[PDB]
Design a protein around this motif. Sequence first.
Motif, PDB file in Angstrom:
ATOM      1  N   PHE A   1      -3.655  -6.374  -7.531  1.00 18.62           N
ATOM      2  CA  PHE A   1      -2.287  -6.079  -7.964  1.00 18.62           C
ATOM      3  C   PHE A   1      -2.017  -6.550  -9.358  1.00 18.62           C
ATOM      4  O   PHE A   1      -2.375  -7.682  -9.739  1.00 18.62           O
TER       5      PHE A   1
ATOM      6  N   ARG B   1     -15.501 -11.662  -7.120  1.00 21.58           N
ATOM      7  CA  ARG B   1     -15.147 -11.815  -5.721  1.00 21.58           C
ATOM      8  C   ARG B   1     -16.241 -11.367  -4.756  1.00 21.58           C
ATOM      9  O   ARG B   1     -16.699 -12.234  -3.974  1.00 21.58           O
TER      10      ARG B   1
ATOM     11  N   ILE C   1       0.867  -1.196   0.000  1.00 21.45           N
ATOM     12  CA  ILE C   1       0.000   0.000   0.000  1.00 21.45           C
ATOM     13  C   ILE C   1       0.900   1.242   0.000  1.00 21.45           C
ATOM     14  O   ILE C   1       0.514   2.318  -0.423  1.00 21.45           O
TER      15      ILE C   1
ATOM     16  N   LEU D   1      -5.023   4.152   4.328  1.00 24.43           N
ATOM     17  CA  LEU D   1      -4.911   3.053   5.309  1.00 24.43           C
ATOM     18  C   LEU D   1      -6.245   2.849   6.047  1.00 24.43           C
ATOM     19  O   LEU D   1      -6.894   1.776   6.028  1.00 24.43           O
TER      20      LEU D   1
ATOM     21  N   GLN E   1      -9.115   4.165   5.281  1.00 18.73           N
ATOM     22  CA  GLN E   1     -10.146   3.926   4.266  1.00 18.73           C
ATOM     23  C   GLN E   1     -10.149   2.556   3.542  1.00 18.73           C
ATOM     24  O   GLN E   1     -11.117   2.222   2.868  1.00 18.73           O
ATOM     25  N   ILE E   2      -9.097   1.748   3.665  1.00 14.81           N
ATOM     26  CA  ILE E   2      -9.126   0.500   2.921  1.00 14.81           C
ATOM     27  C   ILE E   2      -9.436  -0.712   3.768  1.00 14.81           C
ATOM     28  O   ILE E   2      -9.234  -1.828   3.321  1.00 14.81           O
ATOM     29  N   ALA E   3      -9.949  -0.505   4.966  1.00 15.03           N
ATOM     30  CA  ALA E   3     -10.237  -1.633   5.841  1.00 15.03           C
ATOM     31  C   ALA E   3     -10.988  -2.794   5.189  1.00 15.03           C
ATOM     32  O   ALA E   3     -10.747  -3.977   5.502  1.00 15.03           O
ATOM     33  N   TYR E   4     -11.902  -2.475   4.290  1.00 17.77           N
ATOM     34  CA  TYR E   4     -12.686  -3.536   3.648  1.00 17.77           C
ATOM     35  C   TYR E   4     -12.555  -3.582   2.152  1.00 17.77           C
ATOM     36  O   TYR E   4     -13.238  -4.355   1.504  1.00 17.77           O
ATOM     37  N   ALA E   5     -11.662  -2.785   1.591  1.00 18.53           N
ATOM     38  CA  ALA E   5     -11.528  -2.779   0.135  1.00 18.53           C
ATOM     39  C   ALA E   5     -10.862  -4.011  -0.465  1.00 18.53           C
ATOM     40  O   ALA E   5      -9.983  -4.604   0.145  1.00 18.53           O
ATOM     41  N   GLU E   6     -11.249  -4.334  -1.691  1.00 19.13           N
ATOM     42  CA  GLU E   6     -10.678  -5.438  -2.458  1.00 19.13           C
ATOM     43  C   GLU E   6      -9.307  -4.887  -2.880  1.00 19.13           C
ATOM     44  O   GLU E   6      -9.224  -3.732  -3.265  1.00 19.13           O
ATOM     45  N   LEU E   7      -8.235  -5.663  -2.777  1.00 19.36           N
ATOM     46  CA  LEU E   7      -6.914  -5.146  -3.200  1.00 19.36           C
ATOM     47  C   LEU E   7      -6.504  -5.937  -4.474  1.00 19.36           C
ATOM     48  O   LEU E   7      -6.512  -7.185  -4.482  1.00 19.36           O
TER      49      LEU E   7
ATOM     50  N   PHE F   1     -13.375  -7.610  -9.008  1.00 17.11           N
ATOM     51  CA  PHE F   1     -14.195  -7.149  -7.903  1.00 17.11           C
ATOM     52  C   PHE F   1     -15.597  -7.783  -7.955  1.00 17.11           C
ATOM     53  O   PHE F   1     -16.083  -8.282  -6.943  1.00 17.11           O
TER      54      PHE F   1
END
Lengths: 208, 213
Positions: free
Chosen positions: B190, B213, B175, B180, B182-188, B210
Amino acid sequence: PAHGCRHVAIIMDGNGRWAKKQGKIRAFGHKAGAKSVRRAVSFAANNGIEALTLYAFSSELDSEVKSLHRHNVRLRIIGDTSRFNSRLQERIRKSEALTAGNTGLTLNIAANYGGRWDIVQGVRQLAEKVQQGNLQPDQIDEEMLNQHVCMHELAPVDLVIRTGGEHRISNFLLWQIAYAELYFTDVLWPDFDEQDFEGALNAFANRE
Amino acid sequence: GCRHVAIIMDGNGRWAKKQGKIRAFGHKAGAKSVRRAVSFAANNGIEALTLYAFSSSALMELFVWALDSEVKSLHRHNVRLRIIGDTSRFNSRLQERIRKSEALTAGNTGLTLNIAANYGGRWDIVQGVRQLAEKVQQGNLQPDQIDEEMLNQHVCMHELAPVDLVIRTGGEHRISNFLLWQIAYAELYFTDVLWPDFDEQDFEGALNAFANR
Ligand SMILES: O=P(O)(O)C(O)(Cc1cccc(-c2cccc(NS(=O)(=O)c3ccc4ccccc4c3)c2)c1)P(=O)(O)O
Ligand SMILES: O=P(O)(O)C(O)(Cc1cccc(-c2cccc(NS(=O)(=O)c3ccc4ccccc4c3)c2)c1)P(=O)(O)O
Ligand SMILES: O=P(O)(O)C(O)(Cc1cccc(-c2cccc(NS(=O)(=O)c3ccc4ccccc4c3)c2)c1)P(=O)(O)O
């Protein structure tokens, strides 16, 4: 050491799916998951990792502490234990005191942990210092807030592993992973073994 | 249903060398890839697009030049522009341009485009913490009144849909102190694709990743 990785955090996921594929109920996946936890802890200890932080993700510790102590592991429980009954908490702290002097692997287990809460409880501490006329809102920087989040005394988290296929942090560590390598594998937790952990460590070693 | 996408744009320089050209060539191609991602986001109903340029005065005037030449078009495309990050030490003329560009497009109702400039996820959280420390020092805030919801009201972008997907191009799996909290539940997501090469097809692939998933 060789892999360059001092602190590994794992979002453990997949036991349920694992048992279901077997046609067994959740309890079976739980027993398999605990076996996989001992296996990962042994692996980390035998491989010079200084700290291992484990998080049991749910799409929904008294016997162990001795074997832990016997293996020279230092144990810490991170998370909001402020609401548990006072018995547990003592039991928790006893387990902690008991291993504080061990020199091997430091093992952190999340219980009722959230990255946002972690950040908030640290904020509260600084707020308390403010209310005491000791701290000026403008003296608060990153470093200071950093000294107040869980695990600030340990090496920074180098690598975060999430098994089970989901590609998300799910409110596990947030502040602490600002610079960590993030490694996602489809392998279900019960099947995540030494060669999987090694693969993750070598991925980290060649990536950095 | 992906509403807010954040992208860690990385790979321009590395792209440059693979072409056997200078860094300036990579920057040039990176800017074209930005226009294409923004166009693509706006054409496909995405609510917010947040862009972060990762790097291992000039750029200050470049920022001013970019705002001066592109805002009119963002405006016509009904895009609302916001810069997130510490701009407190940017020279005053650039500070004024940022303020006017934001003011000019503040009422647009299409895509909200957030350009991170000297942004850091930790700084962002600390900025919010300092605000709360003020209210506390004044006596209007009790240390135990402070909670997740309250802190959240003081982090960048809290007025926008939550970040659903974070894309990082260029091959690295970190990241890098971008969003930080704001991404607690975001799909990551790469991808090894280098930023200059990231196109409509790569963007959709991430969106599908997304969806499924
Ligand atoms: O993998 P899942 O999400 O399908 C599920 O097994 C939950 C789960 C996820 C990951 C690991 C485990 C697991 C089961 C048993 C023990 C361990 N680890 S543990 O012994 O340190 C432990 C287990 C559960 C805990 C719950 C809350 C705080 C601490 C815990 C520690 C891991 C269970 P489930 O209950 O949601 O089906
Ligand atoms: O047991 P050893 O020393 O022979 C070996 O496994 C190496 C080793 C080093 C350190 C610890 C362990 C060990 C083995 C088995 C289990 C444990 N820990 S554990 O998985 O039972 C565990 C730890 C903490 C827990 C906290 C809360 C709930 C469940 C927990 C489970 C530790 C093993 P080895 O590879 O040298 O044979
Ligand atoms: O990718 P790198 O790390 O190899 C490198 O190119 C640094 C870099 C990373 C990511 C993106 C870029 C990049 C360079 C210059 C500009 C941009 N984007 S931008 O600032 O021009 C921008 C795009 C659209 C805009 C629309 C409206 C207002 C402002 C805008 C700004 C991206 C550069 P480098 O110089 O460190 O090698």
